[PDB]
Amino acid sequence: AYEWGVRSTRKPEPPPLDRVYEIPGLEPITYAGKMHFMPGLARPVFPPWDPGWTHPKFRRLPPLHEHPLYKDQACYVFHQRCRLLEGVKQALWLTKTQLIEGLPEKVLRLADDPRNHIENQDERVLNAISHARLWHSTEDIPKRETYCPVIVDSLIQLCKSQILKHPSLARRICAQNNTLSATWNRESILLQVHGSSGARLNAKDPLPPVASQEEVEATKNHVLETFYPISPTMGLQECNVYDVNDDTGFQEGYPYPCPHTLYFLESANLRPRRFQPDQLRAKMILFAFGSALAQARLLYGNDSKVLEQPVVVQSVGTDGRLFQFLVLQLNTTDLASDEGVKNLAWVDSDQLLYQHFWCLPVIKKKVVVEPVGPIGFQPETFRKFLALYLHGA
Amino acid sequence: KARGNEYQPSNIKRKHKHGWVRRLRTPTGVQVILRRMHKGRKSLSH
Amino acid sequence: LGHRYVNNDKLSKRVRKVWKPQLFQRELYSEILDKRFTVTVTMRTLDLIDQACGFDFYILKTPKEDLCSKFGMDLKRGMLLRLARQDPQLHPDDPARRAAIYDRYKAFVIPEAEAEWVGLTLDEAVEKQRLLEEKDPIPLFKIFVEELLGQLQQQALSE
Amino acid sequence: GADRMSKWTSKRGPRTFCKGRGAKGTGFHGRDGKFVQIKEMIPELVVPELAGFKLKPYVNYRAPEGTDTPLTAKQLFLETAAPAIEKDFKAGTFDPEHLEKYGFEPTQEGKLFQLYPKNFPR
Amino acid sequence: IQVHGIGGGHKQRYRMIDFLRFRPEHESKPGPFEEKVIAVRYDPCRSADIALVAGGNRKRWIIATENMKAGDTVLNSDHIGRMAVAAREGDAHPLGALPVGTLINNVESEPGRGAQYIRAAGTCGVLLRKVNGTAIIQLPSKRQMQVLETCIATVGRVSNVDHNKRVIGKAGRNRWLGKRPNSGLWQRKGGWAGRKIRPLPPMKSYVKLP
RNA sequence: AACUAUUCCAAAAGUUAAUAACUUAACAUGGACUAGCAAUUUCGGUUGGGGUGACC
RNA sequence: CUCGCACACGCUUACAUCAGUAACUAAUAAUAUACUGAUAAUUAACAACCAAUAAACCAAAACAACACUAAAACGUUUAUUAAUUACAUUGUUAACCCAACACAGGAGUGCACCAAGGAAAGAUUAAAAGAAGUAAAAGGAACUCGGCAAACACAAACCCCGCCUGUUUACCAAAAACAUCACCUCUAGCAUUACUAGUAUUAGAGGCAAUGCCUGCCCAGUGACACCAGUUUAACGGCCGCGGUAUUCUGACCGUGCAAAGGUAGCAUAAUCACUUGUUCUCCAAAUAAGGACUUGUAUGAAUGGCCACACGAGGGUUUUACUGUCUCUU
RNA sequence: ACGAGCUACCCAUGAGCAGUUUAAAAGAACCAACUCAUCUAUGUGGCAAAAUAGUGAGAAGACUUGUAGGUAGAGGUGAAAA
RNA sequence: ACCAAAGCUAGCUCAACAUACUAAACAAAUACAAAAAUACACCAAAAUAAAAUAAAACAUUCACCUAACAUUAAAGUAUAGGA
Ligand SMILES: [Mg+2]
Ligand SMILES: [Mg+2]
Ligand SMILES: [Mg+2]
Ligand SMILES: [Mg+2]
Ligand SMILES: [Mg+2]
Ligand SMILES: [Mg+2]
Ligand SMILES: [Mg+2]
Ligand SMILES: [Mg+2]
Ligand SMILES: [Mg+2]
Ligand SMILES: [Mg+2]
Ligand SMILES: [Mg+2]
Ligand SMILES: [Mg+2]
Ligand SMILES: [Mg+2]
Ligand SMILES: [Mg+2]
Ligand SMILES: [Mg+2]
Ligand SMILES: [Mg+2]
Ligand SMILES: [Mg+2]
Ligand SMILES: [Mg+2]
Ligand SMILES: [Mg+2]
Ligand SMILES: [Mg+2]
Ligand SMILES: [Mg+2]
Ligand SMILES: [Mg+2]
Ligand SMILES: [Mg+2]
Ligand SMILES: [Mg+2]
Ligand SMILES: [Mg+2]
Ligand SMILES: [Mg+2]
Ligand SMILES: [Mg+2]
Ligand SMILES: [Mg+2]
Ligand SMILES: [Mg+2]
Ligand SMILES: [Mg+2]
Numbered sequence A: 001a002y003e004w005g006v007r008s009t010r011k012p013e014p015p016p017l018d019r020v021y022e023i024p025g026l027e028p029i030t031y032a033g034k035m036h037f038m039p040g041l042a043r044p045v046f047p048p049w050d051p052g053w054t055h056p057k058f059r060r061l062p063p064l065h066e067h068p069l070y071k072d073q074a075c076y077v078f079h080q081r082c083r084l085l086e087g088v089k090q091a092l093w094l095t096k097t098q099l100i101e102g103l104p105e106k107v108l109r110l111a112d113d114p115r116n117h118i119e120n121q122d123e124r125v126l127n128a129i130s131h132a133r134l135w136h137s138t139e140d141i142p143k144r145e146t147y148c149p150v151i152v153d154s155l156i157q158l159c160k161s162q163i164l165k166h167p168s169l170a171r172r173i174c175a176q177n178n179t180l181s182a183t184w185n186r187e188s189i190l191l192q193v194h195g196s197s198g199a200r201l202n203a204k205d206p207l208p209p210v211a212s213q214e215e216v217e218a219t220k221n222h223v224l225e226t227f228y229p230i231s232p233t234m235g236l237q238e239c240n241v242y243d244v245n246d247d248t249g250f251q252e253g254y255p256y257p258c259p260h261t262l263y264f265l266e267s268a269n270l271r272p273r274r275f276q277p278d279q280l281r282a283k284m285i286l287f288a289f290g291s292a293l294a295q296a297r298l299l300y301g302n303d304s305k306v307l308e309q310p311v312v313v314q315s316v317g318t319d320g321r322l323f324q325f326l327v328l329q330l331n332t333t334d335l336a337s338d339e340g341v342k343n344l345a346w347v348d349s350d351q352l353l354y355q356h357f358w359c360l361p362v363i364k365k366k367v368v369v370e371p372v373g374p375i376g377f378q379p380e381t382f383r384k385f386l387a388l389y390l391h392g393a
Numbered sequence B: 001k002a003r004g005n006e007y008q009p010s011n012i013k014r015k016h017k018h019g020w021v022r023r024l025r026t027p028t029g030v031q032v033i034l035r036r037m038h039k040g041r042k043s044l045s046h
Numbered sequence C: 001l002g003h004r005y006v007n008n009d010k011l012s013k014r015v016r017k018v019w020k021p022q023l024f025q026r027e028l029y030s031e032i033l034d035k036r037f038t039v040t041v042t043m044r045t046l047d048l049i050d051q052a053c054g055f056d057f058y059i060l061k062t063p064k065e066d067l068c069s070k071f072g073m074d075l076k077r078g079m080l081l082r083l084a085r086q087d088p089q090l091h092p093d094d095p096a097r098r099a100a101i102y103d104r105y106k107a108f109v110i111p112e113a114e115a116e117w118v119g120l121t122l123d124e125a126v127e128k129q130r131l132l133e134e135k136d137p138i139p140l141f142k143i144f145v146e147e148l149l150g151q152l153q154q155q156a157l158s159e
Numbered sequence D: 001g002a003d004r005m006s007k008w009t010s011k012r013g014p015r016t017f018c019k020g021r022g023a024k025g026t027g028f029h030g031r032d033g034k035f036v037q038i039k040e041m042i043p044e045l046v047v048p049e050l051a052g053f054k055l056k057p058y059v060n061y062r063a064p065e066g067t068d069t070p071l072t073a074k075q076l077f078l079e080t081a082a083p084a085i086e087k088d089f090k091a092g093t094f095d096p097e098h099l100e101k102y103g104f105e106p107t108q109e110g111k112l113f114q115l116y117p118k119n120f121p122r
Numbered sequence E: 001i002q003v004h005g006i007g008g009g010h011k012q013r014y015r016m017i018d019f020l021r022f023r024p025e026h027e028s029k030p031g032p033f034e035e036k037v038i039a040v041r042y043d044p045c046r047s048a049d050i051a052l053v054a055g056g057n058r059k060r061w062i063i064a065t066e067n068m069k070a071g072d073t074v075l076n077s078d079h080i081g082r083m084a085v086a087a088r089e090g091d092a093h094p095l096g097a098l099p100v101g102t103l104i105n106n107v108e109s110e111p112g113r114g115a116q117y118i119r120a121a122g123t124c125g126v127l128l129r130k131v132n133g134t135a136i137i138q139l140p141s142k143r144q145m146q147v148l149e150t151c152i153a154t155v156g157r158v159s160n161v162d163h164n165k166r167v168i169g170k171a172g173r174n175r176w177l178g179k180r181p182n183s184g185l186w187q188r189k190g191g192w193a194g195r196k197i198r199p200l201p202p203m204k205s206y207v208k209l210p
Numbered sequence F: 001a002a003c004u005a006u007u008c009c010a011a012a013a014g015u016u017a018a019u020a021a022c023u024u025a026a027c028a029u030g031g032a033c034u035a036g037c038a039a040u041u042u043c044g045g046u047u048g049g050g051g052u053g054a055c056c
Numbered sequence G: 001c002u003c004g005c006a007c008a009c010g011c012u013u014a015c016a017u018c019a020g021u022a023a024c025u026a027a028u029a030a031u032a033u034a035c036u037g038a039u040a041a042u043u044a045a046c047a048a049c050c051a052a053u054a055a056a057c058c059a060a061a062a063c064a065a066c067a068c069u070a071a072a073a074c075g076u077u078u079a080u081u082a083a084u085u086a087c088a089u090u091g092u093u094a095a096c097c098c099a100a101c102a103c104a105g106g107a108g109u110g111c112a113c114c115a116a117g118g119a120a121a122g123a124u125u126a127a128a129a130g131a132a133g134u135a136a137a138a139g140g141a142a143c144u145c146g147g148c149a150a151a152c153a154c155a156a157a158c159c160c161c162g163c164c165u166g167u168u169u170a171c172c173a174a175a176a177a178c179a180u181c182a183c184c185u186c187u188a189g190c191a192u193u194a195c196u197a198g199u200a201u202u203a204g205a206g207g208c209a210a211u212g213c214c215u216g217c218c219c220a221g222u223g224a225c226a227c228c229a230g231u232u233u234a235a236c237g238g239c240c241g242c243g244g245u246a247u248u249c250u251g252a253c254c255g256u257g258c259a260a261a262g263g264u265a266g267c268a269u270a271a272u273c274a275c276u277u278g279u280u281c282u283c284c285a286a287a288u289a290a291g292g293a294c295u296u297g298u299a300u301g302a303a304u305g306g307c308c309a310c311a312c313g314a315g316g317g318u319u320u321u322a323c324u325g326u327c328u329c330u331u
Numbered sequence H: 001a002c003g004a005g006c007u008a009c010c011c012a013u014g015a016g017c018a019g020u021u022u023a024a025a026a027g028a029a030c031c032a033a034c035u036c037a038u039c040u041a042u043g044u045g046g047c048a049a050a051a052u053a054g055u056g057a058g059a060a061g062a063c064u065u066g067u068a069g070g071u072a073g074a075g076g077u078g079a080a081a082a
Numbered sequence I: 001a002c003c004a005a006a007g008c009u010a011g012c013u014c015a016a017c018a019u020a021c022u023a024a025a026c027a028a029a030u031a032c033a034a035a036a037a038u039a040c041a042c043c044a045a046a047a048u049a050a051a052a053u054a055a056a057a058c059a060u061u062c063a064c065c066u067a068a069c070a071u072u073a074a075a076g077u078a079u080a081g082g083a
């Protein structure tokens, strides 16, 4: 084979030992007594160094099997920056749900109702777009890590302004950089989603179930799509150290127990750093299932069974120009079998909130052909976002 | 063009080319230092 | 290293010429050490082994200026020390074989204070002497206690 | 061609070259890139109380000096250890094996301030 | 300087290219496997175009064949058979299992060594005959190579066939690729110049006869 | 001459039948061969100024 | 009149206050940022110093929506352990550096054309000669090697040589020299420092120059493969005499000799030995100039490339108008 | 022995190119910053051991340029000017 | 009459004797880019001296040419040398 090491760039082998050491029953004379190198004397062989009192920083790193939580079974862990290849297919397979193209009819009815809109909707959203893309920074061209949390927080403020007409939005709160762990078994391999989120919305009251029993029964005879040469494991991180304990970021007796919306941010300049949209959808499927499974095992217990009360978790993934929307309904804990009831997931894909933005006025043949501001606008994306925020009330 | 300005000063280049450490990494520079000591130089190197 | 004339005529070109010995990688068995050493050797060295009737015989019979090797001096020092100490670690299971090996080389037996210096260079000898004479300095308390005890014994024996 | 006779100083070099003037370090670089100073490396100054202590920095001119006898190891032994050793030998209780009762210490590493490694600065 | 006329090129990242076509993930299952081709991209290091190939829990960049496209299925095997195999354009098979008139690329020299020969864009060798458990192929330099029949080779011609017909517009493109201009020294031609007609050199054999 | 590519012989490792024949993985020594890369040295004198022609 | 402010690099107290200058420094005084003496000074938030070990990562920066080729610097989260505890150290001046000098030279980056920086004249007189500028009757290149320089012009064509952008003799030569795309030869079947982390559509050693028409003959010598025969010129290189003939001039032709073949296509008094200012036409009033023709050039000639061609050139020569102190002839 | 702080060529790490014409960031075009030095005049112990003034060529690339490293004289380097 | 001139000392040179030979100062920092207390290493090495000159050139050769063996003679002898 072709080994990927280079003989020069690798660390050198030790020099071959002096011929005095090969003589049996002979004491070598070395320069260890004068504690410095001397030509003509043999090189001394020292035992491996043993610092009898231990130091934290300057000691060697302990091995991985020395850790108390080390186990022989390799668990596959999903964190924030893991990428999935066939992202929707791997998400549907490892999550055991069914993909639905539209948002639910309750969500569309909430969006399309004219009574649920703000005062001057188009004016405030266009001003929010201009504020995020151009106005909020001293520089002429703000970077994406600046304008993406700004546009997300501005949309959260815009849908938060509805609390005077609907005084049930005060049952919610935002949370940051929490520790999430959800471990389960899916067809003889051990999976675990573990890490953090960008910003997570929680509420006092749970979200009502959104899918009908006819949809649940028609989900039963749905066959999961399979893909042969790639294993569904691929893209996750192999780990031999973990804990089999479902850990949400909130402890017992928390006044806001049920998460209502997750928010996913892609804040990076370069194209290879940001997620592909399929990878972004996969990330929201598996994180939303992690939060939903944390809910449905904290409220029910470690036994694996179908859920008579479904758990509904929503999420919004954001690039800063192009949005993805998810409503995920969890119905089933016993994911070891492939024949039982599958859960549900509604995904709106690639909702463009604006086409392009011009930060500086473009001039062709000494006249202004296009003015400052965003080109193209679709308010249906904001309508879906507002329905996803207002779904509790 | 115009000449006389071949010396563009840089302390990094000066201490890396004519430094004490650079003199003592090579036996020839060591012999340079011994010749300067035998002559009795006030400054052996830079 | 030397000079030579091309075509063996005196009036021809003077040429710098190096002559190098032919080298071979051969393994040699020493009966005293019971070890196989992979030593780069010469055909003259092998001829001298065959003439001196043994590898051990060749090392113990040919002196320093004929051997000219620090490895050869170390080998001679090791086996001469082995013969001087008469160590049981040659063959722990076969005393008859051990006596049979040491019977043949009894002509070169030299005592212990002589046998451990034959293969040492000057720097190794200086380091060995410094290590043997390496003493921590005695505290002046011990010297003063011995002086005071001598004074007290002299005062006690004078009464 | 610069100045060879001038001493090499942190004032002379670029922003990269930062050399101390001889002070002692009091800490290390922590987690956030900041400097974490160790209180244990700080030289705790040891001061007595001088209010109830009577002495002056200048000596009376009429006060006589003395014959200069430098302190000697023999004199220190004869003043400190010799009465105890002489008393124990005249009483028969002298022990050559154990000298710890007379002020002698076999190994320095037991005590707080060593002498040959010079553990204490001043 | 040991090789003249190299330098001043564009910044290039190097892609880790896996040359061994048959590489199982784990030693528990040493059987033949089947992988999926995701994308075919340009590589600045070589004249060929490479392809990302995923199977199991790993991906490898391999050298792409002529019509390998996005989302393809490629079979790698070591199984030699007396009914041979029906060779597609993607499959990797040992030379003992291939038919007689097979066009091949990425030819492995020693069993287990890895693919070394026939790597440039558009170049393909051809299997000639299989005698006494030994394969003989013809290289793009029209030289016969004698190899053990269990060496794995990939059937087909390397992609980017029109690399030979690619025209360089200017000296600026040569400096973009990194080829410095030749020296201005006028050297008179010696006896080495001229149209040398030489007979074909004999078959180069890597089968060690005991 | 050194060095770099060949080739041959010797050295070296060995294999054959009851002395002769044959082979050389990487180094590697000695003596030769073919070439490159090259090493040292020089540009006889008269000339109605040198060069050409001529002469010694 | 406008090279300002600051930072990086570099210099090393030359900076600031007070006092002195007979003399030393300013190429001269006045006094002082450039001499003398004493005393003080630049205070960190800015900058330096400022964790590794495993793993998920193919998907450019160009307002980046999405694309092109030459394939592109710039980091996250997951796990393991990272002394835990106010105040660490270092650079903070300047009118400054490299040029022997207080030198009309050289000097990287960020914002400005002034809101900041400075002074061409030491005082007279207004000779010649010299440098720079402005203006000029009539004429408009008649001056000169050349329309060099200058000008109210800032245009239109023909050649030579190189295709072109580019590069070179730093300090006398920027070109017709070199390189270059394209076209050709040779030499190589291959693994851990070049070539190359490549594999004959590849990589080196070279030649000639894009493109278009083409590249005629020869292995006799000298090289190179073959280790002797034999093969090679897009290898080093070479490609004929003598004599007579058709209605003169010439020679389609023939005789004979030597060679490896006897210079083919093309072009041509040319950047092409000398004759030469070869002969003729146009241009001019006049031309050894220039362009177009004739052409043995007995020493042109085909990748040491031959011919033409668009575009190109601070290259080398020509003509037309326009323009002018170049000049008549200076003021 | 000492020299690649100038220069010749590379390896890193960075930084600049405004306006105008065009489907074009096309080794296109006008012209700044910027880089060279075509021609002329001064200068010739000069401002200067190669400069000043006018005029010129490129100016999105085979372009300049900051910092740092490397190649050393039987040599290095060279779009050959010895 | 200016500019100028004059000293006798600092100190060196050659030997001899002579212990036996890298002086003085080391409180701190010194081979990070020397004079900067403080962290998981790598460390190290040898291969003939050559030529300018003389042989009126220059090829074999050319005393001394950084290898302790001294003086009186043998002796500028035998020998070695494009002899
Ligand atoms: Mg100088
Ligand atoms: Mg100096
Ligand atoms: Mg500094
Ligand atoms: Mg500084
Ligand atoms: Mg702090
Ligand atoms: Mg490459
Ligand atoms: Mg390629
Ligand atoms: Mg070429
Ligand atoms: Mg050439
Ligand atoms: Mg000689
Ligand atoms: Mg010569
Ligand atoms: Mg002569
Ligand atoms: Mg003469
Ligand atoms: Mg004459
Ligand atoms: Mg005369
Ligand atoms: Mg003659
Ligand atoms: Mg200075
Ligand atoms: Mg003055
Ligand atoms: Mg300042
Ligand atoms: Mg004046
Ligand atoms: Mg005048
Ligand atoms: Mg005038
Ligand atoms: Mg005028
Ligand atoms: Mg006039
Ligand atoms: Mg005229
Ligand atoms: Mg002009
Ligand atoms: Mg004109
Ligand atoms: Mg004109
Ligand atoms: Mg040109
Ligand atoms: Mg040009």
Ligand SMILES: [Mg+2]
Pocket: none
């Ligand atoms: Mg150049």
Ligand SMILES: [Mg+2]
Pocket: none
């Ligand atoms: Mg010049």
Ligand SMILES: [Mg+2]
Pocket: G174
């Ligand atoms: Mg030019």
Ligand SMILES: [Mg+2]
Pocket: none
């Ligand atoms: Mg010039």
Ligand SMILES: [Mg+2]
Pocket: none
């Ligand atoms: Mg040319």
Ligand SMILES: [Mg+2]
Pocket: G183
């Ligand atoms: Mg052609």
Ligand SMILES: [Mg+2]
Pocket: none
């Ligand atoms: Mg041509």
Ligand SMILES: [Mg+2]
Pocket: none
């Ligand atoms: Mg030809």
Ligand SMILES: [Mg+2]
Pocket: G219
């Ligand atoms: Mg021939």
Ligand SMILES: [Mg+2]
Pocket: G219
């Ligand atoms: Mg022939």
Ligand SMILES: [Mg+2]
Pocket: none
């Ligand atoms: Mg013609």
Ligand SMILES: [Mg+2]
Pocket: none
């Ligand atoms: Mg002529």
Ligand SMILES: [Mg+2]
Pocket: none
């Ligand atoms: Mg000719």
Ligand SMILES: [Mg+2]
Pocket: G304
């Ligand atoms: Mg030729």
Ligand SMILES: [Mg+2]
Pocket: none
């Ligand atoms: Mg010619």
Ligand SMILES: [Mg+2]
Pocket: G164, G311
């Ligand atoms: Mg063109």
